Nucleic acid binder design. Structure first.
Ligand SMILES: *O[C@H]1[C@@H](O)[C@H](n2cnc3c(N)ncnc32)O[C@@H]1COP(=O)(O)OP(=O)(O)OP(=O)(O)OC[C@H]1O[C@@H](n2c[n+](C)c3c(=O)[nH]c(N)nc32)[C@H](O)[C@@H]1O
Ligand SMILES: [Mg+2]
Ligand SMILES: [Mg+2]
Ligand SMILES: [Mg+2]
Lengths: 728, 729, 483
RNA sequence: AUCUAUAAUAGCUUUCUC
RNA sequence: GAGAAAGCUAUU
RNA sequence: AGUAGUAACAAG
C-alpha cells in the first residue's frame, strides 16, 4: 500500500515557502494548572546557580542574602555565565558612543523632558500589578490609588502635585519612614448551611514596620503564564508593584530613545516597519561584503537571557549613558536598577499535599513551606526546597538579587546586545561582524575571506558576549551562508516569506458584541490579505468561515433556515415580515453580502440603502435600551441595537463583596457627576492640582450665573442654586 | 441642567465617603479614580462570549421608558429578568430581546447616524462609483512605505486637531487660545454652526471629527499607488503575483496627478534612453500611457509643472515645455542656466556629514510663494542674489527661507543647530533638502542670526528688510527688495533654435519612486516599465520560454541571437557605466562555452541577457572579469557569475531555477550529462578547467591578479565553497 | 579592556563550530522503534476513520437533535432494540455492566416522547461521570499535623512506540468520499475581476476538500463541541444525552443526517478554563477492535448488531469510553473550520506562484492540466520503499488532514516538537540549498527534540515520517556530491 | 519629500527561563 | 491566579 | 474512573 508522508511536501517546496505547515496553531494552546511555586523556585535556584562564584553577602537594609556576580571570575566552560565584566561593558558603551556622536546626550535629554512632562496617571496604564497594601494582585489603577491613599495616611503628598517626579520622591521618602499606616482588607468568614464558607471583605487600617514595608515594596509577585505556544514546559512570569513601575518607565524611555537611533536594533520597530528595516540591513550587509570573500549569517538566541543579565550592569549602563545630565536625573535613572538589585521574589500559592486513601487535600502556602518535613514532598520539590533554603526568608519570600525576573528592561537589554554587536572585530583579525538584535534574539552577519575566519569571528563574538554576561545558545543557534536565516519567528529566504499560520488564532469571533465582531473579523481578513500572502480565494473562504462561526456564536442563522432556537423564532418572524430581506443584518438573519471589494465598509453602512425604513428605524433607534446612554437629559446613541454590553458581573463563588462594591460605586458616582459638570473630561484628561469639589463648584457657579444672565432660569431657582453653592 | 446638577452635588455631599473623595482627589487624580475597579477584566473574551451567548440573560438593559416597552415574555421566550431586580441589582435581558426590538420595537429617526458615520458613507460612495480594470498575473515588487490609510478633508497634526475639536465641541472648557488653532478658525466656525442643536453625545461627535481631521499613517506594502483612495482598496489592488486595475471614485488632488505624471515620465525616459532611436520609443510609450484614468498627454497639458523628464516628454509629444519646478511651498521657474547635480559629502552645523546632491553652475529662477514673488540667482554652494517684491510678512519670510535653503550654501548648512535626521525609523532615506526646509520653517531664528547682516542699499525704490518684520536700517546679505520653440533630438536632448542644449536625458533623476495614482501602460510590453526584480524575472522567463530556439541560434549563428527586445528591456536596469564591460565579459564566456562544446544551460541562461550592449573590452582586447554583476536599486539586486544570487540561483540536484523567489523546472530541457559537466568552464573569459587543487601555485587568485596573467599560465580559482579548481587561460 | 579580558579567558570557553553534513543528521527519537514499549494508544476524543454514521434521509428541516436521533434510531430499530451486552473488549479500569446500563439509559431517553434529554443520577451514571471524586479540602494546620498527607508525585506521560493505526488514519482521512459535510454560508456577489478569480479558485479548492473524509470528521468535531458547550452552560447540574450528529449531502444533492453515536455530559460547573467535564461517548463503528488490540486500551467495545450495505453484512460495534473536556478545548473545537484556511492558503500561494510564471490563472492547469501545462504533481508518500507522486488535490487533502490532526492531537508535546523540529528543518533546508550550514551543539538540538516525544500519537508518527523523509533526502543528496 | 505629531480602553501577534 | 515591551486592529 | 501532564479538575 501507498502510505502518505506529509513531510514529502518539503521535497517539492522549500521549507520557508511552506513554513506555515510547521506551526500547529489550529490546536489548543498549552495551559498551566494549579500553582506556579515550583517554577518560581526553579527560577530562583537557576538564577543563583549562575552567580554562586560571585560575592555573597548579607544586605544591611533588609537582611536578605545577596549574590553579586559582576566582576567575578571569568567563566571556564560553556555553561550560562552571569559574570559580566564592568570594564568590557564600559568599553562597548564607549564604542557605541564613538560610532554615534551625541546619541547618549540626545536620549538623556529626551527622556528628561518626557519625565518632566509625565503625569502620575501614566502608572495606570498597566495590567495586574502587585499591591503591597494587601499583598495581592490588583489592577494598576486600583493599586496606584491604594498607594496614594496610603501615602496620604503617612503624611506624603507628592501625588497631589500631579507629576511623576514628586510621586517618585515621595516613594523613596516612604522607604525612609520607620512605620507605614495603610488600608488593608479583612475577609469576614461565615459558615453557610447549604456547609460552605462565605467571604465578605472590608477595609481596615493596618500598620507595618520599616523593614517589612521595604521588603513589601521590593517584592515581585510571581504567577504562571497561560496560552503560550512553542514550549513543552510551562514557566512563571512576575509582576512588580507601584514602587518599581514608577521608576522603570524612565529607564525604558531612555533605552527606547537610544534604540530608535541604532541601525542594529530590532526594537521598537514592529510589523512591516521592522520587516523593511531588516530587509534594508540585510541588503546593506550583502552589498558591503568584500569582493572574493564569504559571508555567514548566524541565527542565534541567547539562553538564560533574563537569569544572567544583572541589574548592577544596568546601573553602570545608566550611569555611563546619562554622563552629561544634571545630577537629579542621574539619580532618578539610577533608582530603578538599584531597586531591581535588591528585589525579593514572592514564591506563589505554595504546594498542595494530598492523602489519596482518605481523599483529602490541603494547600501549604509559601510561609509554611518549611513547617512540613521535607520527606512529605516529591523528589523534585524536595531537592528544589533544599537548594532554596539559604535564600528563603521566613515571610515566604526568596532573595533574588541576581538576574532580571521577567522582561522588564527589554530595551536596555537590547542596547547591551547591540553594544556587543558594535565591536565588529577582535584583535584586528581578518573578519568583520554586524547584525540585528531584538531583546535576546539576534542575527549575526560575519564577512571574512573564508569559512575558517568566519568561524573565528563567531567564536570571538561568543566570547565577547560572555564578557558582557550574554550567553549564546549553542543548541538553538546555527550558521549558514548569508541569504537565508530566521529572526523573531520571521523567516528570510531572499526576502521575508509570509507566515500565515501565525495569524490563524486571530480569525475567530472576537467577542465584543455583534456589531464590533463583524467589523473586526472583516478587518482581520483585509489586513491578512495585505501583508500575510492571503490570496483572494483564501480570503473569500475566510469570509465564509467567519460568517459560519458568527452565526453559531450569536445564534443568528439565516432567516429562511429551520434552525431551532430562542432567538431564531423572532428571527424567522422578522424574515417573514421584512420585505427588503437583503437589508437585514447578519445578526438579524440577513444574508452576508461581504466580498473582497467591500471588506472595509461597516455592515450597517453597507446595507443602509437596501434596508427597510421600519427596520432601519428600529435598528438605529437613538434611545434603544441596549446601548448605555450617557446621562447625569438623555443623549442620542447613533450605533444600533447590536452594540450591546455584556455587563461583567464577576460573581466569584462563595464570596459576597459588599464593601469593595461600596467604594467602587462611590468613585463611580463622583466621576459621573464630574463628567456631568465637565463634559470634556472624557475626551481630554483634565488637569489641575485643586480638589474636584472646588473645580465642580466653580464650574456650576459660572454655569448658573451665565444661564441666569441669558434668561434660562428664574430668580427663585437661581437664589436656591446660589444658596446651595454657598452652603458648600 | 445647572440646578439639577447642584441638587445632585448637595445630595452626594451627604456621605462622609463621597465628601472625602471629592475633597481629597485632585482634578489630575480624576484620571486615576475613573479607572478604579477592584475586579480584573476577564481574559480570553472570545471564550467568554461563546460561553455567555448560551446563558439566559447575558445583556444589560439601561433602565428607562424604552426598556419597559420590552415584554417580559414573548411566545414562551423570556426576554428579560422579572421585576425582582429592578433596583439594587441591575436588569438584564436576552439576545432574543434585541431581535424583538429590531422586529416589533418602536421606530425612531435614523438621522445623526448618517452624520456621525459620514466618512464611511463617503468610503462606500468611492467604492460604488468605481471602475475595475483587467487583472494581470505576473511578478509584483512591493515596497513597505508609510502611507495614509484613509482620505482626509483637512489633514492636521493630532495636537492641533485636538485643540480644534475642543474649540468646536467644548469651547467653555477649552483653555489657552493657542495661536495655531486660530489658523483653522473659519473651519471651526463652520462645524459649530452645523452642530448647534445636535443631541448626539459629545464624545461620539468628537471621535467623528477626529476621524475626519486626523490622519492615520501606517507602514504597508505598496506597488505603484500610494494615494489614500488606493490605500483603502490596497487589499484588492495587488498581491505578490497579480495586479488588479482599479479606478476609484471621487475627485483627486492636482498634487497626486503631478507626482504620478513625473514618475511616469521618468520611467518612460529610463526605458527609452536604452533603445535605438529613444525618441521613437519614448513617443510610442507616452502615447499609450494612462495616469489613473486620463491619458498622459492630457495630464501633461493641463498641469503646469513637472520636472526635466516631464519637459522632455512634453517636447517629444509636441507640446510646450514649462521649466517650472516645485519646492513644496516654493514654485520656481527657470530663466537661464544649465547645471548638474553631483553627490558629495557635506558638513552640517551639528557636525554630521551627509551625502547630498548639490547643483553646480549659476542659474536664475523666478520664485513664487503664495502671494509673494521674486527672482533668485544662485551659484554652486554660494548664494548670489534674491530680489523680492512687496508681499505679506509671513509669506515674505517663508519665501526667504525657502530660497535660502534652495541655494545650498555653506551659511545655511552651518546655521543648522538641533536634531535633524535624514533616515526613516525603518532606515530609509529622507531627502535632505526637504528635511532642512521643514526644519527651518519653525526654527529660522538661528538661521537668520547665523546669516548676519550689513548696511542697507540706498537705491531709489529699494529698501532693506530685517527679521524684525519691519522697515529696518540693516538688511541681511543677499536680499534686495525691488518694488517694481525647443526641438528635441534623437537622444532625447532639448536644443534651442541655436544649438545650445537646455536639458538632456542625463538630467533626469535616478530615483525610483511610487506614483500616488495607478499608472497604466496600455501596451503588450508593459512589464518593461516595472521595477528591477520584475524586469529580471520577466526577462528570464522569456529566456526560458524561448530556450530551445535561442540555443539553436547560438550554436549555429554567432551574433544575431544577442539582439532581442527582452534584452533591450533588461539593459535599462544595468547601470550604464558597466553595461559594455558586462556585455564583453558575458559574450566571451558564452563564446568559450560554445567553442569547446562545454555547454551549461544554467550559465547560458544566466549570462544571456547581459550579452546585449555593445562590447567594451580593455586595451589588450581581453574583456573585464567579474565576480558579480550589479543591477540598479537595492543591495540585493545582483547576479553572481559562479554561485547563486537573490535574483538567480540554480539547483542541479532538482534541476530547479530559482528566479526572484519563483521556481522554474529546468528538467526536460536539459541533458543530465551537464550534471557531470564542469562549472569552471563558464565562470571566466578565456579560461578552462585543468584539474584539481594544486598546492604548487598556492592561493586562489583574485580578479585583478587574474586579468594580468599571460596566456598559457595556470591559476587556482575557487568556484564556490569547497570547490577548489585550477584553471588555465 | 575587551582584548585584555579575552586574552586571559580560558580557551575552553568556545563556540566549537562543526560543519554540518548529511552523515551527521541522525534519526530523531530512536526509542520510538523500541518494541519493548507499548504501541501508542488511540486517545482522540471521537472516532475518525472508524466512525460509522447511521444515515437517515432528512426532509430539509433542522428538526431537533433529540428528534433527529430518535428518527435515526427508529430507522435502525434492530440496533436500538438490542438489550443484551455482547462484550468484545473491556477497558482495564472500567465497568462493562455500568457502561451498558448507561448506553441503554441513553437509548431510552432519546427514543421516548418527552422533550428533555436529561438522565437520572443513577449509580452507573454517577460512576461513569465521576461523582464525589474530588478530594475534600481541609485546613492547613490539620494537614501539617497529619504525617500521611504528602505531596503527590506527578504522573509523567509514558514513552510509546510507533503504531500503524496513525499511518492508516492518515491514509483514510485524505481519501475521497461521496458525501459533503461543509456548510459554508453565502458570499456577496462578485464585481471585481479579482473576486471572479477567487470564486473560480474556490470552486476547485473546496470541491476537492469537501469530498474527503477529513472534512466530515472536522464537521463532526465542530458540531459536537458546539452542542457540548451549549449544553454545559445551559445544564450545569444535569446529566444530558448529546447525540453526535452530522448533516451531509450526496452528489445528487439529497441531504442526509448521520448519527455517529451518543454522548453523556456529567455535571459541568466549570469555574475555571481548565476545569474538566466528563463526557461518556458511545460511538458506532464497523471496525473489529480485536484486529488491533493495542489501539484500543481506552475503549469498552460491545457488539450491538449488524448492518447491510451489500450482499455481505458488517458487524456494528459500540465503542464506549469515559473522556473529558474543558472550556478551552470546546472553544477551540468550535473553530476547527480554520483547518481549511491553513490548508488552502498554503496551496493557493503555490498556484499563485505558477500564475506569475505563466501570465494567466493556473488553477485549472494545476488541478487538471490544459493544452499548455501538464497537471502539477507532488511527492506524497511511499509505496514499497519508493517515492510516489499524487495530484495537486491529493496534496491539498494531505495538508488539510495534517492541520486537522494538529487540532485533534494537539497538546504541549506537539507544540514543543513542532518548534524544535522546525529548527532542524531549517538546518536541513540550508543543507539542501548548499548553504554550508555550521552547527554549535547538534546533540543539544536532538535532545530538545526528543524531550517532547512521549505518547502523542501524532508526534510519534511525525518523528517516524521525519526519519523517512530525511533518509530520502540523504539518498537524493548522494547524487549532488558530484557537481 | 510623512519627515512632526499621536487621549484612554480592549483584543491579537511577537519576544521575554528549560 | 494570568506580567513587561513592541507592532497592529477595533471602540469610545 | 477519566481528562490530563511536573499540577490540577473530577462542584463550592
Ligand atoms: O517625489 C520626489 C519628486 O518626484 C518630487 N518632485 C520633484 N520635482 C517635482 C515637481 N517639480 N513637482 C512636484 N513634485 C516634484 O519631490 C521628490 C524629489 O525627489 P527627486 O526628484 O529625486 O529629487 P532630485 O534628486 O531630483 O533633486 P533634489 O535636489 O533632491 O530636489 C528635488 C527638487 O529640488 C530641485 N532643485 C533643488 N536645487 C537645489 C536645484 C537646483 O539647484 N537646480 C535645479 N534645476 N533644481 C533644483 C530639484 O530639481 C527638484 O525640483
Ligand atoms: Mg532566550
Ligand atoms: Mg533567533
Ligand atoms: Mg529568543
Amino acid at each position: 500500500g501507498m502510505n502518505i508522508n506529509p513531510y514529502f511536501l518539503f521535497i517539492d517546496v522549500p521549507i520557508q515557502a511552506a513554513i506555515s505547515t510547521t506551526f500547529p496553531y489550529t490546536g489548543v494552546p498549552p495551559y498551566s494548572h494549579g500553582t506556579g511555586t515550583g517554577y518560581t523556585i526553579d527560577t530562583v535556584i537557576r538564577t543563583h546557580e549562575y552567580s554562586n562564584k560571585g560575592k555573597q553577602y548579607i544586605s544591611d537594609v533588609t537582611g536578605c542574602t545577596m549574590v553579586d556576580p559582576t566582576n567575578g571570575p571569568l567563566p571556564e566552560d560553556n555553561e550560562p555565565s552571569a559574570y559580566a565584566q564592568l570594564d568590557c561593558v564600559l568599553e562597548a558603551l564607549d564604542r557605541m558612543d564613538e560610532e554615534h556622536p551625541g546619541l547618549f546626550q540626545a536620549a538623556s535629554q529626551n527622556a528628561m523632558e518626557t519625565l518632566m512632562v509625565t503625569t502620575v496617571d501614566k502608572l495606570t496604564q498597566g495590567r495586574q500589578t502587585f499591591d503591597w497594601t494587601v499583598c495581592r494582585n490588583q489592577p494598576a489603577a486600583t493599586a496606584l490609588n491604594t498607594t496614594i491613599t496610603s501615602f496620604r495616611l503617612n503624611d506624603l503628598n507628592g501625588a497631589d502635585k500631579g507629576g511623576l517626579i514628586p510621586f517618585c520622591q515621595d516613594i523613596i521618602d516612604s522607604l525612609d519612614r520607620p512605620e507605614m499606616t495603610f488600608f488593608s482588607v479583612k475577609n469576614i468568614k461565615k459558615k453557610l448551611p447549604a456547609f460552605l464558607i462565605k467571604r465578605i471583605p472590608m477595609k481596615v487600617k493596618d500598620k507595618i514596620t520599616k523593614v517589612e514595608y521595604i521588603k513589601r515594596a521590593l517584592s515581585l509577585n510571581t504567577m504562571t503564564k497561560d496560552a503560550e505556544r512553542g514550549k513543552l514546559k510551562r514557566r512563571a512570569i512576575a509582576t512588580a508593584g507601584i514602587q518599581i513601575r514608577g521608576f522603570v518607565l524612565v529607564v525604558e524611555n531612555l533605552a527606547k530613545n537610544i534604540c530608535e537611533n541604532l541601525e542594529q536594533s530590532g526594537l521598537p520597530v514592529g510589523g512591516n516597519e521592522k520587516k523593511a528595516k531588516l530587509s534594508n540591513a540585510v541588503a546593506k550587509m550583502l552589498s558591503n561584503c568584500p569582493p572574493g570573500g564569504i559571508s555567514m549569517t548566524v541565527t542565534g538566541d541567547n539562553t538564560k537571557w533574563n537569569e544572567c543579565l544583572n541589574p548592577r550592569i544596568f546601573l553602570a549602563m545608566t550611569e555611563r549613558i546619562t554622563r552629561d545630565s544634571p545630577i537629579w536625573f542621574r539619580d532618578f535613572c539610577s533608582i530603578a536598577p538599584v531597586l531591581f538589585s535588591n528585589k525579593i521574589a514572592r514564591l506563589g500559592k505554595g504546594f498542595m499535599i494530598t492523602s489519596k486513601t482518605k481523599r483529602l487535600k490541603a494547600q501549604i502556602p509559601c510561609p509554611d513551606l518549611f513547617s512540613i518535613p521535607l520527606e512529605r514532598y516529591n523528589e523534585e520539590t524536595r531537592a528544589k526546597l533544599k537548594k532554596l533554603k539559604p535564600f528563603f526568608n521566613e515571610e515566604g519570600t526568596a532573595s533574588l538579587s541576581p538576574g532580571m525576573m521577567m522582561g522588564m528592561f527589554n530595551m536596555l537589554s537590547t542596547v547591551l546586545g547591540v553594544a556587543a554587536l558594535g565591536i565588529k572585530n577582535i584583535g584586528n583579525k581578518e573578519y568583520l561582524w554586524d547584525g540585528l538584535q531584538s531583546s535576546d534574539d539576534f542575527a549575526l552577519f560575519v564577512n571574512a575571506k573564508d569559512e575558517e575566519t568566519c568561524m573565528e569571528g563567531i567564536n570571538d563574538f561568543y566570547r565577547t558576549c560572555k564578557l558582557l554576561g550574554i550567553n549564546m545558545s549553542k543548541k538553538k543557534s546555527y550558521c549558514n551562508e548569508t541569504g537565508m536565516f530566521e529572526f523573531t519567528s520571521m523567516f528570510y529566504r531572499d526576502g521575508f516569506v509570509s507566515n500565515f499560520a501565525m495569524e490563524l488564532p486571530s480569525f475567530g469571533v472576537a467577542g465584543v458584541n455583534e456589531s464590533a465582531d463583524m467589523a473586526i473579523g472583516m478587518t482581520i481578513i483585509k489586513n491578512n490579505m495585505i501583508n500575510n500572502g492571503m490570496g483572494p480565494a483564501t480570503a473569500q473562504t475566510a469570509i465564509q468561515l467567519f460568517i459560519a462561526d458568527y452565526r453559531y456564536t450569536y445564534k443568528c442563522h439565516r432567516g429562511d433556515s429551520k434552525v431551532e432556537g430562542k432567538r431564531m423564532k423572532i428571527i424567522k418572524e422578522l424574515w417573514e415580515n421584512t420585505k427588503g430581506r437583503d437589508g437585514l443584518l447578519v445578526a438579524d438573519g440577513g444574508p452576508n453580502i461581504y466580498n473582497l471589494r467591500n471588506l472595509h465598509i461597516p455592515e450597517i453602512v453597507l446595507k443602509y440603502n437596501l434596508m427597510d425604513p421600519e427596520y432601519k428605524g428600529r435598528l438605529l433607534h437613538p434611545q434603544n435600551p441596549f446601548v448605555g446612554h450617557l446621562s447625569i437629559m438623555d443623549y442620542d446613541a447613533v450605533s444600533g441595537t447590536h452594540s450591546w454590553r455584556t455587563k461583567r458581573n464577576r460573581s466569584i463563588l462563595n464570596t459576597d463583596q459588599r464593601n469593595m462594591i461600596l467604594e467602587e460605586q462611590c468613585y463611580a458616582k463622583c466621576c459621573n457627576l464630574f463628567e456631568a459638570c465637565f463634559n470634556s473630561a472624557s475626551y481630554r484628561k483634565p488637569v489641575g492640582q485643586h480638589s474636584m469639589l472646588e473645580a465642580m463648584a466653580h464650574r456650576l457657579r459660572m454655569d448658573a450665573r451665565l444661564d441666569y444672565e441669558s434668561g434660562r432660569m428664574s430668580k427663585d431657582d437661581f437664589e436656591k442654586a446660589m444658596a446651595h453653592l454657598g452652603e458648600i | 441642567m445647572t440646578l439639577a446638577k447642584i441638587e445632585l452635588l448637595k445630595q452626594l455631599l451627604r456621605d462622609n465617603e463621597a465628601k472625602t473623595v471629592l475633597k481629597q482627589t485632585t482634578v489630575d487624580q480624576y484620571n486615576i479614580i475613573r479607572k478604579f475597579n477592584t475586579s480584573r477584566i476577564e481574559k480570553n473574551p472570545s471564550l467568554r462570549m461563546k460561553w455567555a451567548m448560551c446563558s439566559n440573560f447575558p445583556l444589560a438593559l439601561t433602565k428607562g421608558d424604552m426598556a419597559n416597552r420590552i415584554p417580559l415574555e414573548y411566545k414562551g421566550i423570556q426576554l428579560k429578568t422579572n421585576a425582582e431586580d429592578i433596583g439594587t441589582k441591575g436588569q438584564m435581558c436576552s439576545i432574543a430581546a434585541v431581535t424583538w426590538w429590531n422586529t416589533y420595537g418602536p421606530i425612531g429617526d435614523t438621522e445623526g447616524f448618517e452624520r456621525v458615520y459620514e466618512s464611511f458613507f463617503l468610503r462606500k460612495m468611492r467604492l460604488d462609483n468605481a471602475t475595475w480594470g483587467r487583472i494581470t498575473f505576473g511578478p509584483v515588487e512591493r515596497v513597505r512605505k508609510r502611507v495614509l490609510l484613509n482620505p482626509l478633508t483637512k489633514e492636521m497634526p493630532p495636537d492641533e486637531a485636538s485643540n480644534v475639536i475642543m474649540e468646536i465641541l467644548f469651547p467653555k472648557e477649552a483653555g489657552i487660545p493657542r495661536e495655531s488653532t486660530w489658523i483653522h478658525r473659519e473651519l471651526i466656525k463652520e462645524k459649530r454652526e452645523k452642530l448647534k442643536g445636535t443631541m448626539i453625545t459629545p464624545i461620539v461627535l468628537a471621535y467623528m471629527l477626529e476621524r475626519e481631521l486626523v490622519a492615520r499613517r501606517r507602514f504597508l506594502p505598496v506597488a505603484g499607488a500610494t494615494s489614500a483612495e488606493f490605500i483603502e482598496m490596497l487589499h484588492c489592488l495587488q498581491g505578490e503575483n497579480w495586479r488588479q486595475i482599479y479606478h476609484p471614485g471621487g475627485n483627486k488632488l492636482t498634487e497626486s496627478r503631478s507626482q504620478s505624471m513625473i514618475v511616469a515620465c521618468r520611467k518612460i525616459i529610463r526605458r527609452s534612453i536604452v533603445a535605438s532611436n529613444p525618441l521613437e520609443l519614448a513617443v510610442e510609450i507616452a502615447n499609450k500611457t494612462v495616469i489613473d484614468t486620463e491619458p498622459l498627454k492630457s495630464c501633461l497639458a493641463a498641469i503646469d509643472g513637472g520636472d526635466v523628464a516631464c519637459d522632455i516628454i512634453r517636447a517629444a509629444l509636441g507640446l510646450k515645455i514649462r521649466q517650472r519646478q516645485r519646492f513644496g511651498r516654493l514654485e520656481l521657474k527657470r530663466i537661464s542656466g544649465r547645471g548638474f547635480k553631483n553627490d558629495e559629502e557635506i558638513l552640517i552645523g551639528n557636525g554630521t556629514i551627509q551625502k547630498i546632491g548639490i547643483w553646480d553652475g549659476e542659474e536664475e529662477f523666478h520664485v513664487r510663494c503664495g502671494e509673494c514673488r521674486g527672482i533668485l540667482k544662485k551659484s554652486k554652494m554660494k548664494l548670489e542674489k534674491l530680489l523680492i517684491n512687496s508681499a505679506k510678512k509671513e509669506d515674505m519670510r517663508d519665501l526667504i527661507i525657502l530660497c535660502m535653503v534652495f541655494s545650498q550654501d555653506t551659511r545655511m548648512f552651518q546655521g543648522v543647530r538641533g536634531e535633524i535626521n535624514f533616515l526613516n525609523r525603518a532606515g530609509q532615506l529622507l531627502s535632505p533638502m526637504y528635511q532642512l526646509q521643514r526644519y527651518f520653517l519653525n526654527r529660522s531664528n538661528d538661521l537668520f542670526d547665523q546669516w548676519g547682516y550689513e548696511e542697507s542699499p540706498k537705491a531709489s525704490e529699494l529698501h532693506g528688510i530685517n527679521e524684525s518684520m519691519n522697515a529696518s536700517d540693516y538688511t541681511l546679505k543677499g536680499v534686495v527688495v525691488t518694488r517694481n520653440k525647443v526641438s528635441i533630438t534623437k537622444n532625447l536632448s532639448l536644443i534651442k533654435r541655436t544649438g545650445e542644449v537646455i536639458m538632456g536625458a542625463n538630467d533626469v533623476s535616478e530615483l525610483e519612486s511610487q506614483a500616488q495614482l495607478m499608472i497604466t501602460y496600455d501596451t503588450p510590453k508593459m512589464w518593461e516599465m516595472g521595477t528591477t526584480k520584475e524586469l529580471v524575472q520577466n526577462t528570464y522567463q522569456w529566456v526560458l520560454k524561448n530556450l530551445v530556439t535561442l540555443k539553436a541560434q547560438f550554436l549555429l549563428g554567432k551574433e544575431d541571437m544577442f539582439q532581442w527586445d527582452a534584452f533591450e528591456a533588461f539593459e535599462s536596469i544595468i547601470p550604464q557605466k558597466m553595461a559594455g564591460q558586462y556585455s564583453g565579459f558575458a559574450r566571451a564566456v558564452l563564446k568559450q562555452m560554445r567553442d569547446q562544446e562545454v555547454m551549461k544551460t544554467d550559465q547560458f541562461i544566466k549570462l544571456l541577457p547581459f550579452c546585449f550592449s555593445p562590447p567594451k573590452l580593455r586595451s589588450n582586447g581581453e574583456p573585464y572579469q567579474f565576480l558579480k554583476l550589479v543591477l540598479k536599486g537595492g543591495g540585493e539586486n545582483f547576479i553572481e557569475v559562479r554561485k547563486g544570487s537573490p535574483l538567480f540561483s540554480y539547483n542541479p540536484q532538482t534541476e530547479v531555477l530559482t528566479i526572484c523567489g519563483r521556481m522554474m523546472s529546468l528538467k526536460g530541457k536539459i541533458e543530465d550529462e551537464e550534471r557531470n559537466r564542469s562549472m569552471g568552464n563558464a565562470v571566466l573569459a578565456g579560461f578552462l578547467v585543468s584539474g584539481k587543487y594544486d598546492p604548487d601555485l598556492g592561493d586562489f587568485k583574485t580578479i585583478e591578479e587574474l586579468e594580468k596573467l599571460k596566456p598559457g599560465e595556470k591559476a587556482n580559482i575557487l568556484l564556490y565553497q569547497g570547490k577548489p579548481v585550477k584553471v588555465v587561460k | 579592556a575587551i582584548e585584555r579580558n579575552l586574552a586571559r579567558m580560558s580557551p575552553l570557553v568556545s563556540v566549537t563550530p562543526k560543519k554540518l553534513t548529511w552523515e551527521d543528521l541522525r534519526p530523531i527519537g530512536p526509542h520510538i522503534y523500541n518494541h519493548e514499549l507499548p504501541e501508542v494508544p488511540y486517545n482522540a476524543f471521537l472516532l475518525m476513520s472508524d466512525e460509522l454514521g447511521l444515515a437517515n434521509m432528512t426532509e430539509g428541516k433542522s428538526k431537533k437533535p433529540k428528534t433527529l436521533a430518535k428518527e435515526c434510531l427508529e430507522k435502525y430499530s434492530t440496533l436500538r432494540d438490542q438489550t443484551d451486552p455482547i462484550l468484545i473488549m473491556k477497558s482495564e479500569k472500567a465497568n462493562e455492566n455500568f457502561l451498558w446500563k448507561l448506553w441503554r439509559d441513553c437509548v431510552n431517553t432519546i427514543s421516548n416522547e418527552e422533550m428533555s434529554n436529561e438522565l437520572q443520577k443513577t449509580n452507573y451514571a454517577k460512576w461513569a461521570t465521576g461523582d464525589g471524586l474530588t478530594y475534600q479540602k481541609i485546613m492547613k494546620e490539620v494537614a501539617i499535623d497529619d504525617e500521611t498527607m504528602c505531596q503527590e508525585e506527578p504522573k509523567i506521560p509514558n514513552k510509546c512506540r510507533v503504531a500503524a493505526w496513525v499511518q492508516t488514519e492518515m491514509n483514510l482521512l485524505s481519501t475521497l468520499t461521496s458525501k459533503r459535510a461543509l456548510d459554508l454560508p453565502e458570499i456577496g456577489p462578485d464585481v471585481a475581476p479579482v473576486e471572479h478569480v477567487g470564486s473560480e479558485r474556490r470552486k476547485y479548492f473546496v470541491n476537492e476538500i469537501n469530498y474527503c473524509k477529513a472534512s466530515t470528521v472536522m464537521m463532526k468535531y465542530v458540531l459536537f463541541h458546539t452542542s457540548l458547550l451549549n449544553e454545559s452552560n445551559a445544564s450545569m447540574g444535569k446529566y444530558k444525552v448529546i447525540p453526535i450528529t452530522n448533516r451531509v449531502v450526496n452528489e445528487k444533492g439529497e441531504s442526509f443526517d448521520m448519527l455517529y453515536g451518543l454522548a453523556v455530559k456529567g455535571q459541568s460547573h466549570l469555574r475555571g478554563d481548565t476545569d474538566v467535564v466528563t463526557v461518556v461517548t458511545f460511538e458506532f463503528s464497523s471496525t473489529d477492535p480485536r484486529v488491533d488490540s493495542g489501539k484500543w486500551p481506552k475503549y469498552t467495545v460491545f457488539r450491538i448488531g449488524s448492518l447491510f450495505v451489500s450482499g455481505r453484512e458488517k458487524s456494528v460495534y459500540l465503542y464506549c469510553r469515559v473522556n473529558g473536556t474543558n472550556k478551552i478545548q470546546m472553544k477551540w473545537g468550535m473553530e476547527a473550520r480554520r483547518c481549511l484556511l491553513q490548508s488552502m492558503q498554503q496551496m493557493e500561494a503555490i498556484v499563485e506562484q505558477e500564475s506569475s510564471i505563466q501570465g494567466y490563472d493556473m488553477t485549472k492547469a494545476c488541478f487538471k492540466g490544459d493544452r499548455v501545462n501538464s497537471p502539477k504533481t507532488f511527492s506524497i508518500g511511499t509505496q514499497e520503499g519508493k517515492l510516489v507522486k499524487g495530484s495537486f488535490g491529493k496534496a491539498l487533502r494531505v495538508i488539510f488532514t495534517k492541520c486537522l490532526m494538529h487540532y485533534v492531537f494537539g497538546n504541549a508535546q506537539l507544540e514543543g516538537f513542532s518548534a524544535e523540529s522546525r529548527r532542524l528543518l531549517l538546518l536541513i533546508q540550508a543543507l539542501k540549498d548548499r548553504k554550508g550550514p555550521w552547527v554549535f551543539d547538534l546533540e543539544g538540538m536532538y535532545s530538545g527534540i526528543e524531550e517532547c516525544i512521549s505518547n502523542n500519537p501524532w508526534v510519534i508518527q511525525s518523528a517516524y515520517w521525519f526519519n523517512e523523509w530525511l533518509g530520502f533526502e540523504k539518498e537524493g543528496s548522494k547524487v549532488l556530491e558530484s557537481v
